[PDB]
Design a binder for this molecule. Structure first.
Ligand SMILES: [Mg+2]
Ligand SMILES: [Mg+2]
Ligand SMILES: [Mg+2]
Ligand SMILES: [Mg+2]
Ligand SMILES: [Mg+2]
Ligand SMILES: [Mg+2]
Ligand SMILES: [Mg+2]
Ligand SMILES: [Mg+2]
Ligand SMILES: [Mg+2]
Ligand SMILES: [Mg+2]
Ligand SMILES: [Mg+2]
Ligand SMILES: [Mg+2]
Ligand SMILES: [Mg+2]
Ligand SMILES: [Mg+2]
Ligand SMILES: [Mg+2]
Ligand SMILES: [Mg+2]
Ligand SMILES: [Mg+2]
Ligand SMILES: [Mg+2]
Ligand SMILES: [Mg+2]
Ligand SMILES: [Mg+2]
Ligand SMILES: [Mg+2]
Ligand SMILES: [Mg+2]
Ligand SMILES: [Mg+2]
Ligand SMILES: [Mg+2]
Ligand SMILES: [Mg+2]
Ligand SMILES: [Mg+2]
Ligand SMILES: [Mg+2]
Ligand SMILES: [Mg+2]
Ligand SMILES: [Mg+2]
Ligand SMILES: [Mg+2]
Ligand SMILES: [Mg+2]
Ligand SMILES: [Mg+2]
Ligand SMILES: [Mg+2]
Ligand SMILES: [Mg+2]
Ligand SMILES: [Mg+2]
Lengths: 152, 55, 117
RNA sequence: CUUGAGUCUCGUAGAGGGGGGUAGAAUUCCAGGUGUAGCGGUGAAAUGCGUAGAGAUCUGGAGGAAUACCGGUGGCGAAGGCGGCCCCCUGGACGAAGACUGACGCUCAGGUGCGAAAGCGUGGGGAGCAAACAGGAUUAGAUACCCUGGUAGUCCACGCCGUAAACGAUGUCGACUUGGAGGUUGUGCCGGCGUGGCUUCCGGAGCUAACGCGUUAAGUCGACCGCCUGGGGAGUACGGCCGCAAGGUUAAAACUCAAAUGAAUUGACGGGGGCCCGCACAAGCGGUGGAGCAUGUGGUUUAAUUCGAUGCAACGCGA
RNA sequence: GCCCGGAUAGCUCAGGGUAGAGCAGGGGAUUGAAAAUCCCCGUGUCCUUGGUUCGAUUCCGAGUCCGGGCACCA
RNA sequence: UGAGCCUUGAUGUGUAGGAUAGGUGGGAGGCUUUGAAGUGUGGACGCCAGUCUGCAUGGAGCCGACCUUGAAAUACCACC
């Protein structure tokens, strides 16, 4: 805000994996404060992804995540009434947050049966570069590189 | 603003020397000053205004 | 088509566009490129990025002549005065001389009236 | 009679004026070589130019206008004004020592002369710029601001015109009255010491409604001239004089209002400047506006649909 | 009547081993707006038919239509 | 500087595949110290994968039918 005094809120870790990343993934997935439901959904999705990929739950998740992280975004800046689209770098924490938000949003728009099935299919598609999340990442990248002249 | 590069110096130092030579030559100032016609009354007005503001 | 091995680059930079031409010492053009001809239309046409893109494209277009030495004369006050020469050097030429050759009247004719914006 | 006023001897500085010549940079046009798909313009565009070869680049030629740097609240002139270099003609100012005339002085109604720019007549000239005009935009409209073109004019010779916020909004001449910091230009004595002319800034007494002026007075006095008498009507009508014309100069009356005005003070406002704060923006999450129902209100209906709140700060409000 | 060239997307259109470039229109990043950008999307016997060829939008014949120069014009 | 006209030398990897092999063809012998496999090196062309090309060193081998193709190997040769 106007003060630059805010702090960082600590987060409880994953029970059976001990990864803060999956806890934040559950938090992003969680709606209405029902955290047990989100934990069950994410655990089922990770289990089916691990069995259908064979590596494990963890590095398969990270590999799927890395295909969605962006490295440059676009910010509007007003100069003379007309707004320039300046390309700016993205902090790694913002990269993780954007990737998980995109993955969950893409999962919610699918015609599959259960939420875990949608999440598993989307996560595998991202892991092998065919989901809509990678499409959104490519859209952002192309829009950012199009306005490369405004990058002072 | 004629810069003849000497022996083995890098490109950056020659470019900086050329920029400095163009800065001390008042090239862009003259170019911007001759873009539009400014009346003699405005010339005297702003010259005197600069003089009094300095003092 | 011919080997000259040493030419001069003319950069014509204004507030709206930059034009780069390559010629031999006698003053016969070999190739040219422009910021507006490189897919930059409008405000984007008047930026240093477009100027250095045009510089790279013009350097590419004159490949068949085997240029190894190059002088530079730059005229005009435009934003693309320094990006172009940097891009031209990075393309592999040797900038052996830099000159500003912008015209300046020694009085001259009456400039247009001022814009009331 | 010599102190006011003027003449003579030597010198200094200066965009002071009239005439003629010449130089360099740049814009425009003309012819030619290289070379190829854009150029130009804007907040964004479009009109406009270009494959009949533009824009870019190089060579040669024609023509007109103005003189970058020096350049400076620097200089010259009564004012208006005056800026490359060179020659011819010419006006004034100041300085040092001496000589000469002997009140020859100051101001000035009527009169006469000069007087930016625009404008008018005749004859040339025309690169750049640019009223009028045409087209493209923006806009609710745009007879404008912005863009592309573009004719009188701007330039020269002669002749009219006689007006400007022609302003220091401060008539000319003379004498007297504490200081400080500079600029420019002469001169005497030994970098120091003095002494004249013009000029910029601050400030004391004094003056002023205040702002402010302050030895270059808006301080204290003397001589002469011009001008003012509430605001509109009106610097207008009629008459005279001047002009080719546009118009200039002198200059009222009826009627109407109780004010019009100057300087400064306290706030408020600014599509003025500086510094800050708030789920005020920016980052996120969940909603309302669509559907069904509950409830309040407006409106319409009724014998009555009781009364009040009814921009934010009334409408699941008094209840 | 003859000769000369053409038939390709919704439009304009180049092209013996393929169907191609731009804009039109639709949605969304997108902002109050045209901008302006990004993203895709289709948009096809390459006029019809027949004929060679390992298959022809391509080469060949006959037809439908457009344009040009001619000829008949008693 | 245009148009036709001969002669030469190149030029032509849909997909097979050692092979940047067009229609056609008498037809597996030419080539070879008339210095030849393979070379350093000059150079051309190029859907840049590969075709063409002088000299030098070097010294005398490549080689036709062979399996994939619609076809063989510019082994000479001729028709476009
Ligand atoms: Mg202009
Ligand atoms: Mg003089
Ligand atoms: Mg003079
Ligand atoms: Mg030319
Ligand atoms: Mg003076
Ligand atoms: Mg004199
Ligand atoms: Mg004189
Ligand atoms: Mg006497
Ligand atoms: Mg007098
Ligand atoms: Mg008089
Ligand atoms: Mg005049
Ligand atoms: Mg006139
Ligand atoms: Mg005239
Ligand atoms: Mg005339
Ligand atoms: Mg013009
Ligand atoms: Mg108009
Ligand atoms: Mg007057
Ligand atoms: Mg004046
Ligand atoms: Mg006055
Ligand atoms: Mg006095
Ligand atoms: Mg004072
Ligand atoms: Mg007074
Ligand atoms: Mg006085
Ligand atoms: Mg006085
Ligand atoms: Mg009058
Ligand atoms: Mg009269
Ligand atoms: Mg007042
Ligand atoms: Mg204020
Ligand atoms: Mg304020
Ligand atoms: Mg917000
Ligand atoms: Mg509702
Ligand atoms: Mg009520
Ligand atoms: Mg009541
Ligand atoms: Mg009421
Ligand atoms: Mg309530």
């Amino acid at each position: 805000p106007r003060r630059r005094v805010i702090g960082q809120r600590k987060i409880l870790p994953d029970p059976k994996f001990g990864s803060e990343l999956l806890a934040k993934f559950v938090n992003i997935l969680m709606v209405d404060g029902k955290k047990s439901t989100a934990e069950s959904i994410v655990y089922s999705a990770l289990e089916t992804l691990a069995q259908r990929s064979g590596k494990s739950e963890l590095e398969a998740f990270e590999v799927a995540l890395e295909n969605v992280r962006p490295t440059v975004e676009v910010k509007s800046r007003r100069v003379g009434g007309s707004t320039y689209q300046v390309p700016v770098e993205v902090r790694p924490v913002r990269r993780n947050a954007l990737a998980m938000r995109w993955i969950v949003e893409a999962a919610r728009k699918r015609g599959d049966k259960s939420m875990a099935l949608r999440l598993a299919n989307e996560l595998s598609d991202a892991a092998e570069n065919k989901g809509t999340a990678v499409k959104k990442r490519e859209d952002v990248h192309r829009m950012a590189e199009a306005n490369k002249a405004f990058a002072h | 603003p004629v810069i003849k590069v000497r022996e083995n110096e890098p490109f950056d130092v020659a470019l900086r020397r050329f920029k400095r030579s163009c800065e001390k030559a008042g090239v862009l100032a003259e170019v911007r000053r001759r873009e539009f016609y400014e009346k003699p009354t405005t010339e005297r007005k702003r010259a005197k205004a600069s003089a009094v503001k300095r003092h | 088509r011919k080997q000259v091995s040493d030419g001069v680059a003319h950069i014509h930079a204004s507030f709206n566009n930059t034009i780069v031409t390559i010629t031999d010492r006698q003053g016969n053009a070999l190739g040219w490129a422009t910021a507006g001809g490189s897919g930059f239309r409008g405000s984007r046409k008047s930026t240093p990025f477009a100027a250095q893109v045009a510089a790279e494209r013009c350097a590419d277009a004159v490949k068949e002549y085997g240029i190894k030495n190059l002088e530079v004369m730059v005229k005009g006050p435009g934003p693309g005065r320094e990006s172009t020469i940097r891009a031209l050097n990075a393309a592999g030429f040797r900038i052996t001389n830099i000159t500003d050759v912008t015209p300046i009247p020694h009085x001259g004719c009456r400039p247009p009236k001022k814009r009331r914006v």
